[PDB]
Design a protein around this ligand. Structure first.
Ligand SMILES: Nc1ncnc2c1ncn2[C@@H]1O[C@H](COP(=O)(O)O)[C@@H](O)[C@H]1O
Ligand SMILES: Nc1ncnc2c1ncn2[C@@H]1O[C@H](COP(=O)(O)O)[C@@H](O)[C@H]1O
Ligand SMILES: [Cl-]
Lengths: 179, 178
């Protein structure tokens, strides 16, 4: 299978029972630490996105905090800027926020109101898709700026969690899948 | 310097955020303008090569806004990026370090296996203010017996004497405000 995709897959480290028993934590750290693995990940994402959307993409939106690690590089590769979707309380100026369910409690994401103008087309990036709550909340916020979410993408997807279905009808793509 | 102007023109200031008195320096417009972002990373990367040649082994990006620059800076330099995170995010054995942030305490963490003794690291974050965050990152790295060659940022608030706080570790910023 794809040699570039293998550079990424080999650099995913799986930690059982973190944070809780029975959960397998997928750690993307080694992808970052290996310059050829990171270059491979950004390349595969970028090639997917240009092939799927051509010139439609206006900005990449990176999710706080591990999507920050990929969004700017992905955006740079596509010749685009990167806008930021943060945990609530961290961005100055006018914002929109959206509450969502995260593990056992509620969290809040926010965006600056001037991050995007109506009609602008975005692709959302994070490291991993699990339940899809975080991506879904990001999609909500972007939709409220009257931006169009073309797709959400991640390095890893946990398929038994049906995060994909939660995002439908917004398309989704992952480099790698685990149950 | 037209390159430095590209970054300077895209820092936005917000008085009295998060708390009255703080003038927040927002790097968001740098990220949004691909020429500005490319300029910030190039200026940092040129400085670091001019100052350290090929002695740098890794960039360390600090959670969370250093994450926006770390990977790109590391790639431009041909290096990997290690992560220094806010505590409770990393799996496997870690160490952590407390520091004063606002009116209380926060902690940064690193995996015990993030680096090997003797490996040489440059830490990046968006902005240096008091230097508490950067100083905790240096502490962590020194606890892994890594050598911190320098810390770098886009913005430095000079009245806050973050540079002195990191001394004798060298520091470089693209832009300075009081
Ligand atoms: N098993 C896992 N391993 C690593 N990160 C995870 C895992 N499950 C969820 N996450 C993180 O939690 C968020 C995804 O949660 P969700 O909103 O359920 O898709 C993302 O920020 C992921 O980085
Ligand atoms: N005026 C400011 N504007 C933007 N970020 C700030 C400001 N002051 C502190 N920070 C953030 O707080 C951390 C630096 O604080 P310090 O630990 O005091 O250097 C960095 O992670 C910065 O991103
Ligand atoms: Cl709101």
């Amino acid at each position: 299978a794809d040699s570039e995709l293998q550079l990424v897959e080999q650099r995913i480290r799986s930690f059982p029972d973190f944070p809780t028993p029975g959960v397998v934590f997928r750690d993307i750290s080694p992808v970052l630490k290996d310059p050829a693995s990171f270059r491979a990940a950004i390349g595969l994402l970028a090639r997917h996105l240009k092939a799927t959307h051509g010139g439609r993409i206006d900005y990449i939106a990176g999710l706080d905090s591990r999507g920050f690690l990929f969004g700017p590089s992905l955006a740079q590769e596509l010749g685009l800027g990167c806008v930021l979707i943060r945990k609530r309380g961290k961005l100055p100026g006018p914002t929109l926020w959206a509450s969502y369910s995260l593990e056992y409690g509620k969290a809040e994401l926010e965006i600056q109101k001037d991050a995007l103008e109506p009609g602008q087309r975005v692709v959302v990036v994070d490291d991993l898709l699990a339940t899809g709550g975080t991506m879904n909340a990001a999609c909500e916020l972007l939709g409220r700026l009257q931006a169009e979410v073309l797709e959400c993408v991640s390095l890893v997807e946990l398929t038994s969690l049906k995060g994909r279905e939660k995002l439908a009808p917004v398309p989704f793509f992952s480099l790698l899948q685990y149950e």
